[PDB]
Amino acid sequence: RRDWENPGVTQLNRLAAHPPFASWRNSEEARTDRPSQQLRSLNGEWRFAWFPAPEAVPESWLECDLPEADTVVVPSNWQMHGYDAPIYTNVTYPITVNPPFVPTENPTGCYSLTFNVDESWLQEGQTRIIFDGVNSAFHLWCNGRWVGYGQDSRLPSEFDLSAFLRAGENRLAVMVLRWSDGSYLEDQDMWRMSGIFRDVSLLHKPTTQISDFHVATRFNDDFSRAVLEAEVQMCGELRDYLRVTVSLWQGETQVASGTAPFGGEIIDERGGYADRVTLRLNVENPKLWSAEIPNLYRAVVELHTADGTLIEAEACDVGFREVRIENGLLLLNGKPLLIRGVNRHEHHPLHGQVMDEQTMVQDILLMKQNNFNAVRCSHYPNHPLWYTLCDRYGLYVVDEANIETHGMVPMNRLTDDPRWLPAMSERVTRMVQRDRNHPSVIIWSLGNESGHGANHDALYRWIKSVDPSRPVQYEGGGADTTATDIICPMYARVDEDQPFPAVPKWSIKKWLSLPGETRPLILCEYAHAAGNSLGGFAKYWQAFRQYPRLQGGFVWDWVDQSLIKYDENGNPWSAYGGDFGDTPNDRQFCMNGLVFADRTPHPALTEAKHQQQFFQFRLSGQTIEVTSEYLFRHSDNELLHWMVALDGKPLASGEVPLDVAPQGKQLIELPELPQPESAGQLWLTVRVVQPNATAWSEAGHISAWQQWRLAENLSVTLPAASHAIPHLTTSEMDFCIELGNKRWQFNRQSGFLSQMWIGDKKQLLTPLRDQFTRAPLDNDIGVSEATRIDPNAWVERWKAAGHYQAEAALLQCTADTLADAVLITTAHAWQHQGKTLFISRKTYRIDGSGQMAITVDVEVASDTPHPARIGLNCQLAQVAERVNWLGLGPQENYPDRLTAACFDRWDLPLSDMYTPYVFPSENGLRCGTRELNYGPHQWRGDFQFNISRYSQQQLMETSHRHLLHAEEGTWLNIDGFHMGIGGDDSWSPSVSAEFQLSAGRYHYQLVWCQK
Amino acid sequence: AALLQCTADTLADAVLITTAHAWQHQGKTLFISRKTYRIDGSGQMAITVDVEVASDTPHPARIGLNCQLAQVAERVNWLGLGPQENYPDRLTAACFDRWDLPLSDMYTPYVFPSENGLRCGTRELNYGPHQWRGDFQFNISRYSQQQLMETSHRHLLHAEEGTWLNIDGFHMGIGGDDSWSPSVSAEFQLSAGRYHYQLVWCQK
Ligand SMILES: [Mg+2]
Ligand SMILES: [Mg+2]
Ligand SMILES: [Mg+2]
Ligand SMILES: [Mg+2]
Ligand SMILES: [Mg+2]
Ligand code: NA
Ligand code: NA
Ligand code: NA
Ligand code: NA
Ligand code: NA
What we know:
This is part of a larger assembly, with two copies of chain A. Helix content of chain A is 10%, strand content 39%. Chain A is mainly β.
């Protein structure tokens, strides 16, 4: 019947969806969420055989093991075991678009397992098998007999096996199809894999059982009182002696308990639900749940007889919180939220899409430690443990239906088609039925990038109808359709409109006030983090804080979707689209996370942490004003450390306890500070420290910081008259300056400093020359390709203008001797096709102190695309261990992404001055630097710089980081100016005007000397 | 202005004068100005100016040079934004072109005297036998900034000897969102800390 090519058949003999069950036969166990002997895990070693198509599967496989089969671990994605290749495609479907058909060559994975079942499980009750996740469709057999079928790769499919099992050994056979009509609703931008990638378990339930239960919490006006309402449903034989008891606990303290026989209130002309009952429990002064303070209660649901015999018990963690939209604002417990969120795909560099507790906990800790309070399940229901962790650790969750049809044309071709409504409805309804009791879930999403169809409006209303406790959002069709309670655009900019036809992305500030608009705005996706990105992140947060209805967004995204591969020598390396022979593919577009696949932070993560801080600061004289952005908690685990330093040299510091109420302020007056002796700029740095450890952080954790320039005393003292005077030697080929053990060689043909000597040791491997280009960042490239060039992308504009091929034409090179120094004057023209792009005019002044002052003045043709940078570069002959500098750091920072960096004296091993982006590009820049020390060299001024063993040329010509080779010496790039990196999105120019080098004329000066 | 340095050097085809000044008040260094004057065999004087502004001092109204010329000419010819008075935050209406007006038009008769007549984005200025070239803002009139500041009514202003010239590498915005509180937007305040501009003074 080819059920996998029929959207009308999404399952066969599958049991109803429901909240997590464990069927405890002991109430204390249910209260403490301890393991249940009735819920068995079937994870572990299974038998597996790969086939090119279901027609290739031998009928013998149903009755017994295939000798050809291998023993593999389950859960897993069979691509991770190397049976076939994982495919990385963004929008374009991995299969020919011909709904509801899939390729005849359909990779088929045959899983089997021989397992034991005790007769006690079969003598009474019901035994069901639970598949938490099977990608993308499968048929199930037990002991050779067909059981059922199921689709939707991200929700559990359960089947009753009571009539198929026997005491002792039993064998399951699962035929998993890689492609199915379900694949048409699973076009998410991620690796396309398959298999039994989530847990498999067996659950025993009594015949008379709890088949479902919904927990809800209502409050009075000030949240000082609440009522917990628990609707319980049963299956099996109704008996007057049956009872349901619901008890609520706060730790080991029982807060409330209620008991009642089955029989619900009258519903309509035919009566009510004889198989249901609703318990209502009053709770005075409830401890409220929030991401700030994840207070949780435990609700235990007991099904028992009047005489007191327990039949079975179920339970869940309960978080008392109200979520509602009022007067245009999304409120949690009556307070307006500020969503510091991120989109998070379920991805592991080694295990593919199989999630484990350790990885989940690690992600959550990193998120909270970096000031994130919310996560969007892009773009499907997650592993069930994810919600439990978010409930307990405290994170707001957007639960999203597994529906994405991005590849359709138009995007809503299937979602506006009534014939696909059934399939879509199951993806939404079964998600709600499964996760509705989790307090962490505060918003339901109808899916992602599937246009806007009538099916969306229908399902939007279904959710509003069945669960009025949570708002529903959906971005498809313009981000503000009738299917969303929240304006949730993706990549809409702060001030710039992008008036696309039909689905425009208005400036978020403008969007809010469009005629008749009243809803809150929270970006479902923003700040695309591809490689060296997040430029302009501060601009979003300034807007979020100033506009009440701009309530945040979810960054795109958490982790790079890179996979590990091994070279000829067995060494591991990060691979992306196309590295598995997969084609077509979208190469490196699968990597745009704030952290590498192994969870190591990208530099951009700290920018996010700083901008998402929960404490705001203002300075006025000696008074520091601390304002709390917390909505519910007092600062009961925070103290403020302050430090005043003169050009990196500490002069004073101290610490004051923070005692600020949510939304409150605290004034802190700094002690009378003694005036410094030497000249320089005094800097004030404050940081909030958490003295005590928490569930998500260690003692001493820094949660926020800020800096201010205090008094500055300009140096007005002149340097003592030098002893010696530099000697100039003029030859037809060079201008040589000599002073003591130092020598400078200027080539008169090139007009550049070609060599410098300290003693008899050469200091340069490559002359010191102007540089106006950079190895293109992901944002500079966009979607441009050699086969499909995007003339609008920055990299293409630079290439077309000849920025990368420009040659220096010497216009002037002269030498002059002064009373105490030698002055070399040069002028160069960079041309391409007879076009003068840039003109650099310089003067080098070498005086008796051995210092070389370089003054640079550049002209940039107003009609050439603004250059990526304006500076100098050279390859130093030396390689040192440390890099010391007075400036912004310690991490990588660019003009439009340097708010998190702090001005101070930093010292790091050379290696930390290089950022290992999987896709090589300009990196490691540090801005606002007044002094740089490397080996025997020191550079002073006011510049930006990067230093590493990789030339810009190599970074630009290398596709993967593991292919980079350290070059001889050290490449130094010192810029007077550097273009922003952008990142509002990665398919169009996103560098704001104020961060583009458009002045036309630029000036900077550097002093080079021996440290 | 406290003088910190003033040297003279003779080059292959020119004379180079280098100076350094520090403007102080109550022992506080407000601004430091470093310059070089290069006079070549063609009679042109190239002036390079580099200024440091203490970060803790209120951002300055302008950063430039001024002097009282001995001559009084009838016309002012310039290649820049014009023809009317324009400032950094009020120059959108002005157009870049070659303008030529009588001296009086380079002065705006505001009833209450103040800085006025500025023209921005100017690459060349011509007055009498003088010619200034670069990328600066300037105003030129028979009234000193001092007189303008000390005179309450325009009718009480008297033309001074010669002509007062104010050439700025940079000039602060004039603001105006209201007139009882600071209204010059951040992007138009001179808060960069370090400023650079260059001019060539010659005779034509
Ligand atoms: Mg089907
Ligand atoms: Mg047997
Ligand atoms: Mg998509
Ligand atoms: Mg800051
Ligand atoms: Mg205009
Ligand atoms: Na807001
Ligand atoms: Na991507
Ligand atoms: Na505290
Ligand atoms: Na590259
Ligand atoms: Na006046």
